[PDB]
Structures are given as structure tokens and as C-alpha cells.
Structure 1
Amino acid sequence: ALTQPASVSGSPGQSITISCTGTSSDVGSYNFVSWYQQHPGKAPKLMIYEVSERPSGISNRFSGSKSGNTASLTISGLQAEDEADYYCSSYAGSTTFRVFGGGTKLTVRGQPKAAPSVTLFPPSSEELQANKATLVCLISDFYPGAVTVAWKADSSPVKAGVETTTPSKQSNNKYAASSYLSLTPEQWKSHRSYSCQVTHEGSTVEKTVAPT
């Protein structure tokens, strides 16, 4: 029930402000606004409580305030590590008790573009004996988040049997994705090799694996 902008962005060393609008039932009437930082794959971390107070350990770059029905989180001296989703919440009376905002994605501009590290594994002997073959292409530490992967049997494009994840942000603010190719053991042994080829901003990284 609290309204926050979907997205804010700034460059390093800049200041940004995230707004959190409620009503007199919650934000307007109480000093019970708290703000949370959440990195992808992690629990939320309290940055601010009782509108303006900072838990021990929180950078004094973070500050909070409130005017009428709107509370504000300020980050000054922006650092790449501040990239994260931020959430406000408020006490909301004896009945509703507590409300969250819908979250704000903060992006910090000027992050180095980074090429994917690619690791390609062949099928294990154990899997081959079990009458299957999975080629595993692991793609990491790339930014920005968009890649397209294409598989090749020898030099020929393979479409069938491919499952590829959507990239999703890692700890470091860089992305990871996986792509899986399913083959019969017979296909695996009747090519010279297979390749996983990752395109990331005009530029291709390719890895190749061969039977034993």
C-alpha cells in the first residue's frame, strides 16, 4: 500500500533520493518508517528505522526523512555496491499494522562492461553409460545482462534440445546464465566436437569440447 518509484539511477559520487508515499493512516501519522536494502539472492538488510535512525554499521551516506505523507531515503556519494532493490515500510495502526512499498530498483551507472567467462563441460562417463548426454555451458561475470547463446555440432547450428536460463544478477552486480544441450551418446561420439557460443554486445566467446 505504499508508493515508491520503480527505478532510480545515478552515477558514482552522486546523490539520489527514493520516495515512499503513503497516507495519514501510516506514513503521515507515525515516525515508524524503515528502509531495506536487498541484493539479489540475499535477505533484506535494515538501512534506516524510525524514519531517520541508522543501525550500527550502516554508512552515514544513507539518511532518511519524512514530510507529510512521504518519506525519503537519500544515498549520497553513490558507490557501485549500493545497487540493489530498496523498500520502505511503515507502521499502519492497530488493524493494518504494517505496510510495505513496492520496491525501488537503484542502478548505479558507469559499471564496466564485462565479457562472459564461459566454461563448457562434456557429458560424464556416468551419464553416457546411463543412455543420456548433457553438455553444460556455464556463463558468468558478464555485464550488461543480455546474452544469446548458440550451440554448434561440429560447425553446424543445433536448435533442438537446448534449454537456456534468463541471466540473473550475481553478488558482484554481474550476471550469470546456463545453457544445457541434450544429445544421445551416439550423437556425442559421432561429432568431432560441440561448441557453446555466447554473444554479448556484438562480441562472441566460444568454447569447444570433444569426446574423451
Structure 2
Amino acid sequence: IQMTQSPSSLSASVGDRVTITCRASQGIRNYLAWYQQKPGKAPKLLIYAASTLQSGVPSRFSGSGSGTDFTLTISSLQPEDVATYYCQRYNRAPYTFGQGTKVEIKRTVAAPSVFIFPPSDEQLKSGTASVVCLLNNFYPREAKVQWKVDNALQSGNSQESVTEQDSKDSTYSLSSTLTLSKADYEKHKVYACEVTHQGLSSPVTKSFNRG
């Protein structure tokens, strides 16, 4: 008993017709369901009996199939439809799920807003420095953050984190953290994050003074 879906991932534009397939390894008649999971939340039931809609579910989600081959169609992709969709066999044990299909959204390119944060004095007391750079409400995901300390490129000492894709305006957000000890942090004046992004004809650079 396997359930397989394709694609594993897809981008598409608001208005587009999206298609997701699900292949059961053995005839399941119409005991197939479709679930959406938004990031952060618990899964909702969209379609059951291969093609029956759950109540209160918008019509633009449509399901077809019988036997082994099944299909979820979303026929007018809206920004709130960003999630991962799962098929599930339920005719019999095992009640197994497909691998999932992440669906990401449009959209026109948008520039980040860049902010810089020094480490609080309550933290240098603690013994270590954290410097934080924030990129806000951009698209697409791709972004380069180069840290610079006394104009020195910095390498091997940042971690990064991306929020999932906003349901409303289809954007991402990034925080970068530069960590280094009180030793090095006291040794320099200019800390800076160079931000490089498709929505920015030239890179933007935020910076502060003290140390």
C-alpha cells in the first residue's frame, strides 16, 4: 500500500488552474479524500468520496477519479489557497497518506524592507553578541544577506530563517542573525547587512555605529 502524488511542489498565479494527481497502488473505488494543511494550522477536509465537497468549502476545489487514478483540481487559485495538500486512502487499513503537495503562489516581484538591530546591552552583560537583520514582505523567496564588520565580509557565522508564505499578499519575510562573542564585537565600529534582491535594482545596505 502506497499513495503517490505529483507534483511534490508547484508555483502558480492567482487565477490559474492547478492540478494535483494521486495514484493508489490498488483499487480503492471512491474511498479517497483530500486535505489542505496551511502552515501553522491543523488539516482540513476538502473533498471526500473522490468528488464530494465538504460543506462550507469553496466550489473552486474539485475532485475526480475512480479505481487507482485520482485528481484534485483547484480552478482559480486564490492567495488563501497556499498550503500543502494531501490525499488519503480510507477504504481499508492502512489509512495511508500521499507525500503531500506544497502549492505556492503568483506573484509580481516586491522589494524587501530592511531593518538592522544591534545587540541590547542586556546581552553583552550575558557574554555574547547577537546582531539581527530583518527583511520584510518581499517576493520571491530568493535573497542574499551579506554581513559586514568594519567592512569585512563575514562568513560562517550567520543563521537564517524564512517565514512561510503570507496568505493575504503572498510574501515572505527573513531574519538573519549574526552571532559573535563580546570579544570580537567590542573590537569594531561598523556592523552592516547588505541585502541583495530581485526587486531592488541595486543592493540596499543597513548599518549602525557603536562598539
Normalising by the smaller structure, the TM-score range is 0.7 to 0.9
C-alpha distance 188-108 of structure 1, shift in aligned 2 (>3 A): closer
Residue 197 to residue 66, structure 1, CA distance change in 2 (3 Å): same
Match of 1:4 in 2: 5
The 3-state SS of whatever aligns with 1:99 is coil
Distance in 1 of aligned mates of 2:10 and 2:183: 52
**Distance 1:16-1:127 versus aligned 2 partners, 3 A rule:** closer
Gaps of 5+ in 2: none
1:153 maps to which residue? 149
How far apart are the structure 2 equivalents of 1:125 and 1:17?
Answer: 53
Shift of 1:33: 1.2
The 1:13–1:131 alpha-carbon spacing in structure 2 relative to 1, beyond 3 Å, is closer
- Indicate how the Cα distance of structure 1 residues 169 and 157 shifts in structure 2: closer, same or farther if over 3 A, else same: same
Q: Gapped runs of 5+ residues in structure 1? A: none
Please show how residues 62-81 of structure 1 align to structure 2 within 5 Å.
62-81=61-80
Deviation string, structure 1 residues 40-86 (Cα, Å, up to 9, x no partner): 33322221122222222211111112133112111112223323221
Matched, 1:116 2:108: no
Q: State the match for 1:176 in structure 2.
A: 173
> How many aligned residue pairs are there?
205
Alpha-carbon distance in 1 for matches of 2:23, 2:202: 43
Per-residue deviation, 1:166: 5.1
- Verify the 8 A CA contact 1:40 1:171 in the aligned structure 2: no
**Does the 8 Å CA contact 1:164/1:177 hold for their aligned counterparts?**
no
TM-score by length of structure 1 reads 0.83
Percent identity over paired residues: 43
Partners of 1:116 and 1:205 within 8 A in 2: no
Deviation at 1:130, TM superposition (A): 2.4
Partner of 1:49: 48
- Hey, what does 2:15 align to over in structure 1? 13
Structure 1 residue ranges, 4+ long, deviating more than 4 angstroms after superposition: none
Q: Does 1:23 align with 2:25?
A: yes
Give the match's secondary structure for 2:124. Answer: helix
Does the 8 A contact of 2:82 with 2:165 survive in 1?
no
Report the residue type matching 2:19 in the other structure.
Answer: T
| Equivalent position SS for 1:78 | coil
> What is the CA–CA distance in structure 2 between the aligned matches of 1:104 and 1:45, rounded to whole Å?
15
Matched position secondary structure for 1:18: strand
Indicate the RMSD between aligned Cα atoms, in angstroms.
Answer: 2.4
